[model samples]
Target: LLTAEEEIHYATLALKGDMEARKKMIESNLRLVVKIARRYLNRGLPLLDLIEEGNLGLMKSVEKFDPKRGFRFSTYATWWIRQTIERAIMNQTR
Candidate 1:
């Protein structure tokens, strides 16, 4: 887990379009994706698939996240993760 300062440090670099920083940010939060993915277990998709979709959302979140806004990365990533997973489930059912 990243400390608040580490998060801010990487976020600052990520905002500047640093690919390595972006990668670090994404890697650090992967556990969060798994945690969120578990919430939708047995809802049409396997946990692995949910995690894959959530990882896509997590990438999007990393791209769009504004650490200067004073929000935690997990908080912002959670929304993106849920949205992608929900969309995947909906599309599968349709």
Candidate 2:
């Protein structure tokens, strides 16, 4: 996320409500989602579910993230990954 300078430009366009840019935004984010999913293994949902949730969080987060913070997309995505993962596990208990 923080590594790609080009993606930063894409993010700017994405935040401007450009559908194609947001598509690129979401596509580029898939790599990080799986990486984070690996760490949450055997907690509640299976690997696929965890990954799915991570993507969902990314999808949700992409709408609300503040690119002006000069942070990379993955930086904020990490927070959403954990947040959504924990929330999923929490709900599974009940």
Residue 62 local lDDT, model 1: 80
Q: lDDT by residue for model 2 over 41-89, one digit each (tens)?
A: 9886899999988888888767766678877787887888888888888
What clash count does candidate 1 reach?
A: 0
Which 10-residue window of candidate 1 scores lowest in summed lDDT? 61-70
lDDT of 1 by residue, 1-94 (tens): 7899998888888888888988988888889999999999999899999999998899998886898788998898899999999999999865
TM for candidate 1 is 0.91
lDDT of 2 at 87: 84
Error of 1 at 41 (Å): 0.9
Clashing pairs in 1: none
Deviation from native of the Cα of residue 17 in model 2, angstroms: 1.6
**TM-score of each candidate?**
0.91, 0.84
**Which candidate has the top score in lDDT?**
1
The 0-to-1 C-alpha lDDT of every candidate, in the order given, reads 0.90, 0.80
